[PDB]
Design a protein around this ligand. Sequence first.
Ligand code: HEM
Ligand code: HEM
Ligand code: HEM
Ligand SMILES: [Fe+2]
Ligand SMILES: [Fe+2]
Ligand SMILES: [Fe+2]
Ligand SMILES: [Fe+2]
Ligand SMILES: [Fe+2]
Ligand SMILES: [Fe+2]
Ligand SMILES: [Fe+2]
Ligand SMILES: [Fe+3]
Ligand SMILES: [Fe+3]
Ligand SMILES: [Fe+3]
Ligand SMILES: [Fe+3]
Ligand SMILES: [Fe+3]
Ligand SMILES: [Fe+3]
Ligand SMILES: [Fe+3]
Lengths: 157, 157, 157, 157, 157, 158, 157
Amino acid sequence: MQGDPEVIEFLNEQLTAELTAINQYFLHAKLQDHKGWTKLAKYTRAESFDEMRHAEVLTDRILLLDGLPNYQRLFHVRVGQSVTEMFQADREVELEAIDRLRRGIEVMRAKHDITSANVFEAILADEEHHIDYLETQLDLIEKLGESLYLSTVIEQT
Amino acid sequence: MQGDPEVIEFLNEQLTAELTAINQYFLHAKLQDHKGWTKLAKYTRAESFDEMRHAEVLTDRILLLDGLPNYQRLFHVRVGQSVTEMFQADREVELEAIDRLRRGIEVMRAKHDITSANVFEAILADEEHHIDYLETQLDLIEKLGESLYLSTVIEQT
Amino acid sequence: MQGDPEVIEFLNEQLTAELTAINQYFLHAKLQDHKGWTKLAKYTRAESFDEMRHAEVLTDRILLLDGLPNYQRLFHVRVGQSVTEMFQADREVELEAIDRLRRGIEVMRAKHDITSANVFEAILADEEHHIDYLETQLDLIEKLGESLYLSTVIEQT
Amino acid sequence: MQGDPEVIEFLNEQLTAELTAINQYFLHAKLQDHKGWTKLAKYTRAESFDEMRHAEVLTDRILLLDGLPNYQRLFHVRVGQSVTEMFQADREVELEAIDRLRRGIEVMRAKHDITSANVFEAILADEEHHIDYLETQLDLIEKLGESLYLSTVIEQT
Amino acid sequence: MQGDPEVIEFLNEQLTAELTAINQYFLHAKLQDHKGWTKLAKYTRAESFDEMRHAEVLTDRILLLDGLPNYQRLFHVRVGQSVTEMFQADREVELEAIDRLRRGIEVMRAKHDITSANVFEAILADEEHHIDYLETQLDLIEKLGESLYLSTVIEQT
Amino acid sequence: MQGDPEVIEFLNEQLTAELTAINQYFLHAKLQDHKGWTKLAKYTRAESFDEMRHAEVLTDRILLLDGLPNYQRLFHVRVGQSVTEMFQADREVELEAIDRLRRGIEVMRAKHDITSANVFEAILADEEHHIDYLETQLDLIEKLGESLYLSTVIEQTQ
Amino acid sequence: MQGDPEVIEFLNEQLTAELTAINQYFLHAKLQDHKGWTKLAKYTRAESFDEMRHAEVLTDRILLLDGLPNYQRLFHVRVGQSVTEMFQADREVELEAIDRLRRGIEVMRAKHDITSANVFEAILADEEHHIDYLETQLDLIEKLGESLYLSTVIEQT
Ligand code: HEM
Ligand code: HEM
Ligand code: HEM
Ligand SMILES: [Fe+2]
Ligand SMILES: [Fe+2]
Ligand SMILES: [Fe+2]
Ligand SMILES: [Fe+2]
Ligand SMILES: [Fe+2]
Ligand SMILES: [Fe+2]
Ligand SMILES: [Fe+2]
Ligand SMILES: [Fe+3]
Ligand SMILES: [Fe+3]
Ligand SMILES: [Fe+3]
Ligand SMILES: [Fe+3]
Ligand SMILES: [Fe+3]
Ligand SMILES: [Fe+3]
Ligand SMILES: [Fe+3]
């Protein structure tokens, strides 16, 4: 079994996006922990681990179709200074991923490849959940404020 | 055993009120949880299940008297945007229920039907407790403020 | 993320149907229990709880797309008096739901919204299972009879 | 609920294929165990049991649509002498099944029947996994050789 | 307290090397597992996890000195086809790391920074042990033969 | 075995610094606990115990080289009234210690004494960690505000 | 919710009576224990604790109606010398309480306040039980005698 070139192209582009997300989420988690915002750091670390799981699934699927995964290419990694900036950078990454996933699902399903489409469907569900969380947190920061919001995630130990 | 039409009318009106309360409380709990106010959402959910218990008891009593419960009629369901508005809507519902319960208890007890009166007495006690809680929370919001009050009911997960 | 008006319209119509089903099933369970048919009552109660879970899932999906769930609507609620009539009313409700679900799945999937389509697919599977059970029970009643069928669900304890 | 004749035709053809696979896999497992290749025999038995699970699911789906499962006809059952021949026969069976499954999924989904399509999708995923395993084993036999490969799957007991 | 630019430059170069090693080792583990060589795959996976332990330690040290870790650039990632090529690629990576670590330890210790020197000393010990293992495995492949060597790392289930 | 006079001089100076740190940290912990800031008090108590362990290790090393530990000296002990002032005093103490430790490590290692150098290396790592924590807390106080910062370390208990 | 002034007046008078009873019962228990009548002392202590619980319930009810509990006023506290005098003093207190409770229940129930009436009903039941016990003990003392009755409650451990 060999897949079409286009399906493998879509899978490789998604894999590159997943690797970039892993790097960005880890850097942000370390930066947050360094400043004393422990409760945010735990969540960001967990999200990075989720990105690793997605990347492994994509690699498995690519290999099963007699392809060569791309572990050399990266996109642009965004680094933030405030907390609002970190949230906005994550939002940008997630939106790009969602659009790509929808287009890929359509194209793959149009060529009689169902397992790849199901892989993207699961990834799409997870991405939508994460983007929902990010938007909620941005709304909370807007309502409360930087200092009053930050006083609830700092811990003494 | 066949009760008077008026006692069944009172019981059916109370049942309609309880169903409307179930709807409103569950919707409010979902809306609060969506925004990140977790500790409020737990309490609102518990209140909705109390509405469970009240409605089921009323249905049992109506059926025992050879009547037909009304599961088709609803009152007006109020939806709030802030937190103060949600509290005020709940307050309105509770006050209406309390007045109806008192009038019904008098009328029923005047016709030699004691079990129905006891049912309303228990429901009345519970409603008074809930209205007390709501008024206390409104006072707290007034004293502290919206932002400072809201910072105490938000978690990360 | 904001969905199309039509997807939200489909979701709201399904939510109204779910609420109507909850009411009808719970009333039927209470009516059956009052008459001494115990095992039927247990089964009907479980089915009503299933409908409750479906409604909660629909509400979550509607809220995630920046919509307003409709908790004020209600279709016509059918009430039966013998076992055959109860089974037939449930059958009518289920058939309507299945047709609506199929049409909605097509329309949603044609607009690049996959998660909503998956929600309806799961709901459709459950509806088909329930309709199968109802048809089997109607066949059994026809073969055995009302009295000989009812003697097997009556318990005394 | 009655399905279209074509969907039932597809399901019955898949059921016949599943029964033929059960027979072939179990015969191969017995033949391998007779010769002293124990670790191969365990795997082959497990695969035959999986084919049974698939057949039972297909029968359930066919019955739910008011159809008559076909438990009478069989395809051609292939028997091998070496180990390479057994692997090649299994490969042929799997490839035929995969092509049929893809065509059927398209046709079914084009007629507004989703549950049948999901059944075929799950079966397709499992078939692809098994074909992957078979191709890997054939590559290993080619690289090492038949004697050196066979020395690793024999025990005394 | 902020360190010299040169110490941070050394730390950042080592961090880039560690990230490249993580990528290469994980890809090699997946490739080996796909072919049926199981114990090799387990060992390679463990090595990749070790490489990330090193990367996290380096990031912590860089952040403590008021620096900016570099999570953007990568070196050249080598991909092999047979076991010998994979082992040789790993050997090349390890040798480069060893040379860099020795030079960095000298330079850092000459400027009165001891904790950074200790970090590199630990990393250097680990790298030397890994390179020892790789050379031993290459010797074994040369002696036994590549088919007779591969027959000992292939398993069935 | 008899060490050089200079190595013992370095060790004795470090021991005096450790004793001064013990005193200052314990006093600060008591002052913080008296005012109702509980979690700060727990952290400061733990830090004082760490300084005690460091002092014991230094005494052991000095005795092994046929020397006489100095348990009579004391530097100036700083006492603060706010929370910012307490953090700043601790910062001053830590910076002095770090500079002394680096100079001592160089000098000792230049005379073929390795165990003493390793002792100072461990102490230096711990000092750097503590100074990092102090700087982070000062940044947090600057950002949040001192009242909004203090509201998060008070408790009823009892 | 604000109650009528008269209901609050009744509740406050009952609260004053409860506080006076607490004081008298505890003093009597201490006096009895000092003389060596241990088995009487245990019972008197338990009764004082019961009065404490009643007072707490009354305070809660008064506060829920937006009133001010009266913790400053006391009635006349009676102190006895022999056991008969202690029993008679307790009897007097209980009789006064019972009469007041009956009058209050009537008045409150005539103004559509039901929860307060239920509170007094529970308190009235408890008072009647205690007065029954006291009368029985006085009858026993009359039949047996002071010395023969006292010899059965004195213990030495
Ligand atoms: C099931 C698959 C995987 C698992 C269970 C896993 C597990 C872990 C663990 C335990 C850590 C250490 C966490 C820490 O240091 O705080 C980690 C970090 C890391 N892993 Fe993954 N990993 C997986 C896949 C991958 C893949 C595929 C890559 C790269 C292609 C990768 C790259 C990294 C990196 C760069 C870090 C550290 C960066 C940071 O500090 O956030 N991992 N992972
Ligand atoms: C006569 C009508 C209804 C009755 C008798 C009823 C009854 C109940 C009962 C007994 C429970 C379990 C109690 C608990 O665990 O707290 C429950 C929970 C639940 N109810 Fe209802 N209900 C009714 C209407 C509704 C409506 C209108 C909704 C939503 C629109 C709904 C959605 C739910 C959900 C989702 C749960 C699970 C709680 C959760 O997941 O958080 N039910 N209901
Ligand atoms: C609950 C555990 C301990 C308590 C309550 C305790 C009690 C104390 C206190 C309160 C002080 C200093 C008080 C002050 O200076 O104002 C002290 C001095 C000291 N402690 Fe502890 N101690 C404990 C454990 C230890 C341990 C485990 C060690 C060593 C492993 C240790 C070694 C020392 C030393 C060396 C000094 C004096 C050093 C100097 O003054 O230069 N202590 N003891
Ligand atoms: Fe992802
Ligand atoms: Fe309530
Ligand atoms: Fe449903
Ligand atoms: Fe199969
Ligand atoms: Fe390594
Ligand atoms: Fe120290
Ligand atoms: Fe009392
Ligand atoms: Fe994501
Ligand atoms: Fe109620
Ligand atoms: Fe259902
Ligand atoms: Fe199979
Ligand atoms: Fe490394
Ligand atoms: Fe320290
Ligand atoms: Fe009493």
